[PDB]
Amino acid sequence: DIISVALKRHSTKAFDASKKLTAEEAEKIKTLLQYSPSSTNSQPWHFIVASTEEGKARVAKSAAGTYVFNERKMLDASHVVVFCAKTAMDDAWLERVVDQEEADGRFNTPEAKAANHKGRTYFADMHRVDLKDDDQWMAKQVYLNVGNFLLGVGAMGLDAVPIEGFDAAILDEEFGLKEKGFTSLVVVPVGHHSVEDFNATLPKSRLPLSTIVTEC
Amino acid sequence: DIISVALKRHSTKAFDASKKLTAEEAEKIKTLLQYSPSSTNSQPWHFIVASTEEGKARVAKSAAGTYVFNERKMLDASHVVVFCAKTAMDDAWLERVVDQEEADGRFNTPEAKAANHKGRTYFADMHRVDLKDDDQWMAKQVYLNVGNFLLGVGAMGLDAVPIEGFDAAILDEEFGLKEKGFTSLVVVPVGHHSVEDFNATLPKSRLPLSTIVTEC
Ligand SMILES: Cc1cc2nc3c(=O)[nH]c(=O)nc-3n(C[C@H](O)[C@H](O)[C@H](O)COP(=O)(O)O)c2cc1C
Ligand SMILES: Cc1cc2nc3c(=O)[nH]c(=O)nc-3n(C[C@H](O)[C@H](O)[C@H](O)COP(=O)(O)O)c2cc1C
């Protein structure tokens, strides 16, 4: 049951540094990242997956100053995922997307690919040209990917914590992501909680359905 | 297996208007909405769940003009979820979150409730006062709930389609959201696909791991 997963999953505060993902688990987490939906199948994202001790330490440099209370969550977890959004929607990306969809067998005629390209360009152009918000639109898709990921890892029986408390300017410099066209948004350390994770045994808390839902 | 769900779920293009969700499935989808994580447990959201023919036709008035192609997805689904974000983060909201956490038994230490509220008001004030993007930070949390939702509903064996192609100003005017401090961002019809849902038997397409993942 997925609902039991939803009620049991928690934001891990401390990871066991001796528990690592299997090679099968490492492959499956990467499948989850790749297969999330996105508006127009635009997939405007890049992911850093750090599993080495050198790589996690480099990600862990961004939990500087005020974000030092999240550094140990990055170093003790098995795999650390960095979710990055594209910084602008370019026309090369859109043609990369429609060429992948043709290569995957989604179009039956050249008119069906041209129709799909036109339709995606129009909605990319509403954000790029009309609203001037393509940066915010692509970042919103990366957060939907985070949502998908947290539930999926929970359903695999693993522990994780979504981190917004890190320095994105520090992280983007280290991996040289502005040169590559991307910016870091959320860091998700993945592994197994330890006995020091105080949040594992505390109750879940959410606003009641009376406040947050309207039925019509 | 959750990886099977991720590879099997699709964006439905046509729903079977005779197939409805059971009362148990209706309750489970509201549990999925409420239990999604969000930064600092801010839960900066409101959900409209329309299951009646009158309710769904009111949501379908936003599938206007250029967006007429999404109208039928809203009309024939069993349940239509409107994901709304708060338009500003007020102190009143943060207080009801911390009081709910208090009632749920999260702070065994009355000094920890006060410690946690001011940390939440500190990270909410870095967006509503310092960075001035409180509306984008709260919309970001609503897309994380949408990603959580779409994988969960696929894990329950239901069909859905995330919709961005709707007129949010019509949708907000129709349900008086602007005066309640909420704005609609994503519409998600849930139900069971028709025999004429062409997308159900098309192959899934995504960019390769070689483009989207960097391993470190
Ligand atoms: C976008 C996002 C960012 C978060 N950032 C942090 C963080 O920097 N550090 C942390 O300890 N937890 C962080 N969390 C945890 C939230 O406090 C948490 O999801 C929320 O309190 C609900 O608890 P649950 O995850 O255990 O269900 C973050 C969560 C989200 C969704
Ligand atoms: C945020 C968002 C908005 C979308 N808006 C629309 C829409 O307006 N109409 C539609 O038919 N599909 C829409 N979709 C479906 C996307 O085209 C689809 O998710 C994508 O092609 C990947 O296909 P899949 O969901 O079948 O895996 C949307 C998806 C997302 C995530």
UniProtKB/Swiss-Prot annotation, chains A, B:
Enzyme Commission designation: 1.-.-.-
Assembly notes: Homodimer.
NCBIfam families found in the cross-reference section: PRK11053.1 (NF008275)
Xref: InterPro entries: NfsB-like (IPR033878), Nitroreductase (IPR029479), Nitroreductase-like (IPR000415), Nitroreductase/BluB (IPR050627)
Gene: nfsB
Binding-site residues, FMN: 9-13, 70, 164-165, 204-206
Taxonomy of the source species: Bacteria, Pseudomonadati, Pseudomonadota, Gammaproteobacteria, Enterobacterales
Keywords: Flavoprotein, FMN, NAD, NADP, Oxidoreductase
Further remark: The nitroreductase might be involved in the quinone metabolism.
Name of the protein: Oxygen-insensitive NAD(P)H nitroreductase
Organism: Enterobacter cloacae
GO molecular-function terms, A-Z: oxidoreductase activity, acting on other nitrogenous compounds as donors, with NAD or NADP as acceptor
Homology family: Belongs to the nitroreductase family.
Top-level enzyme category: oxidoreductase
UniProt: NAD(+) binding residues: 13, 40, 66, 70, 73, 106
A single BP term in Gene Ontology: 2,4,6-trinitrotoluene catabolic process
GO cellular component: cytosol
Cofactor(s) this protein cannot do without: FMN
Primary role: Reduction of a variety of nitroaromatic compounds using NADH (and to lesser extent NADPH) as source of reducing equivalents; two electrons are transferred.
